[PDB]
Amino acid sequence: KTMRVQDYPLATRCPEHILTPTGKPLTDITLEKVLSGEVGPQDVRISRQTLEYQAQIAEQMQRHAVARNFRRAAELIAIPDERILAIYNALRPFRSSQAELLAIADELEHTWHATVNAAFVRESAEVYQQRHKLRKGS
């Protein structure tokens, strides 16, 4: 449930608790399962739980900003790589209109359940509007 500094590194101290987002245990990512095709690129990813533990380790190190980063990133795991890239790019200067950024926030919150990232993007919309980084022409 909860990790502690002495549980780190998690890969050595608490391997069992480490699962791929796909449900596979760390012990499943081997040359064998890779060559056979049992383990594919989508398996060699981090899961929400893991990031949560790493976050716990971080904050207990007084690295709260890092912990918050990890927790926020945890919400992005299930989102497709292409969508992650598109959202990032939509966040770059003058790419999006305020409405587009809000629409993205809606998707993040209700489709991906990435509540923190939705708030994050909602925040970016306001910031971009006040600092003029939204696509030129409302």
Binding site: P9, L10, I46, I57, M61, I84, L85, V121, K133
Partner: protein, 555 residues
């Protein structure tokens, strides 16, 4: 003629070829303490920073806002900010004050407060402080692995060599953007051939790099830039939010990453807002802190040409490393870019970090001769390797690099060259001929490498990316060609994404792919008798340089 030969000789001195300029504060051409810089200050109102360095919240630019809302401990900033800058400066060198007590204070101060603290310190003081603030106990090193021709065969070989030399991280980039996937790929294979666990990155356009990482072609990202002014951030094609999301994207894939900033970028890019380089860099450091990014590559970095140009520039560079470190961020402290034609001068610039030690003394030591360095040259390169090893022996300073023999280098380079060769053959990529494998084996740089069919490689990379090749495809290709070990090594580099251990501050991997970070390898310096002290084994390795003759056998 009525001219001094003394000065004639002096005029021909390499150092006089260095671009030095007088200060020009209006254009941000000043290392630190700009008369236009703000006076530190902060005000918390109902759990929200509404005042930052003489700026009201309704005056905040994107950076002020991000910093105010994410980079500062609001509940402690008002108190911490009551401390005098010189008092914090004293704490930094005070052996009775732990890095933890300092961190509890700095993570509660402002960008201006941090530079004012630096203003109170001379370089000896900063080094004294840096050795205590460094997050990881054992300093490490990062090198560049590149070449003029973006040659994959040479890249793999140099990566293998750089690996046995001790570098824990390796970074490549490209002359031709389209070559990136091959550089990344070759770097990954070569890196795992020299020393299993070596982290690799391919520094290119942001979205491009994230993609390389998502496809498991790299094990981390570093040049994820942030800037000190909105205008430069804009030309950097990001905002604190797009970059924070980016950092988040990296973490969401279990990919280690840090940001890159460094004094001088805003000036070189034309929008310094009349602020000193260090103040703007301080903002970058706080943006890094606020984004929840564990580390930062700073110390002028690529813009060392700017900082080094003005007075106290090299001191300002050490200062920015210290600020990053005291804020409890992992620091890859530059020394990775050329700024002087003088050995004397470049040496002084690097000793600032090398003597006290940082998470990565060099955030880009050139593992290849500088003519092949695609970052336009590193402060130190492959030809300084012997000098660097002698320095460690001279001063009993762990520089993060060890001596290697020609035999084990030729062997490791040959293996890497064959490995990448087999990976190309297996993936049906343009052929890597035995002539190339052999040339990469004994080469110094690309001057010994036969020319490749560039158009053919570029078309092949496009087809490769289209084929959605990932790190697992490299693993399989290695596995089927008799490189089970390198396949497993790469697989273990990718497995880091599943455990998330190497996401923690200063995290690097030992030869068994076990994580060594500030969390399990904490720097606990409290003066003589404490902190990192070279092991008997490591010290022996440092002094046992090949060629050193046993005195009693000389005649």
């Amino acid at each position: 003629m009525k001219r001094s030969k003394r000065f004639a000789v002096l005029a021909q001195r390499p150092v006089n070829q260095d671009g030095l300029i007088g200060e020009w504060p209006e254009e941000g051409l000043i290392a630190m303490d700009s008369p236009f810089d703000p006076v530190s200050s902060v005000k918390v109102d109902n759990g929200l920073i509404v005042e930052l360095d003489g700026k009201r919240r309704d005056q905040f630019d994107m950076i002020d806002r991000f910093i105010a809302d994410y980079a500062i401990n609001v509940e402690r900033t008002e108190q911490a900010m009551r401390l005098e800058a010189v008092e914090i400066a004293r704490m930094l060198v005070d052996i009775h004050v732990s890095r933890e007590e300092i961190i509890a204070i700095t993570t509660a101060i402002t960008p201006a407060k941090a530079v004012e603290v630096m203003a109170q310190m001379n370089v000896v003081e900063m080094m004294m402080a840096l050795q205590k603030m460094r997050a990881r106990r054992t300093p490490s090193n990062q090198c560049h692995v590149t070449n003029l021709k973006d040659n994959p065969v040479q890249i793999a070989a140099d990566a293998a060599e750089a690996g046995i030399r001790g570098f824990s991280e390796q970074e490549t980039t490209v002359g031709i953007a389209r070559y990136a996937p091959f550089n990344a790929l070759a770097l990954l294979v070569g890196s795992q051939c020299g020393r299993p666990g070596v982290l690799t990155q391919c520094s290119v356009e942001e979205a491009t790099e994230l993609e390389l990482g998502m496809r498991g072609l790299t094990s981390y990202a570093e040049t994820v830039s942030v800037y000190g002014t909105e205008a430069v951030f804009t030309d950097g094609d990001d905002t604190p939010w797009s970059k924070a999301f980016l950092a988040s994207a990296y973490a969401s894939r279990g990919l280690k990453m840090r940001y890159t900033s460094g004094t001088g970028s805003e000036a070189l890019m034309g929008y310094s807002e009349s602020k000193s380089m260090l103040y703007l860099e301080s903002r970058c450091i706080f943006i890094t802190k606020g984004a929840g990014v564990q580390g930062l590559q700073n110390g002028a970095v690529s813009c060392i040409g700017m900082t080094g140009a003005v007075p106290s520039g090299i001191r300002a560079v050490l200062a920015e490393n210290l600020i990053a470190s005291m804020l409890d961020l992992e620091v890859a402290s530059a020394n990775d870019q050329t700024f002087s034609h003088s050995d004397i001068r470049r040496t002084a610039r690097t000793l600032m970090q090398m003597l006290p030690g940082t998470d990565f003394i060099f955030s880009g030591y050139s593992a290849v001769p500088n003519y092949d360095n695609m970052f336009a040259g590193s402060n130190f390169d492959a030809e300084d390797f012997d000098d660097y090893n002698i320095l460690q022996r001279d001063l009993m300073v762990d520089g993060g690099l060890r001596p290697v023999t020609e035999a084990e280098t030729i062997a490791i380079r040959q293996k890497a060259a064959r490995a990448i060769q087999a990976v190309f053959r297996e993936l049906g990529l343009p052929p890597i001929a035995d002539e190339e494998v052999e040339a990469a084996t004994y080469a110094h740089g690309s001057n010994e490498m036969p020319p490749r069919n560039v158009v053919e490689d570029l078309s092949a990379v496009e087809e490769m990316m289209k084929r959605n090749i990932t790190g697992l495809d490299i693993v399989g290709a290695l596995s089927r060609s008799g490189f089970e070990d390198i396949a497993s090594n790469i697989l273990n580099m990718l497995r880091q994404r599943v455990t998330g251990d190497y996401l923690q501050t200063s995290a690097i991997l030992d030869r068994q792919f076990e994580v060594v970070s500030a969390v399990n390898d904490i720097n606990d310096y409290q003066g003589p008798g404490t902190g990192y002290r070279i092991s008997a084994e490591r010290w022996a390795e440092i002094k046992n340089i090949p060629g050193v003759v046993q005195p009693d056998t000389i005649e």
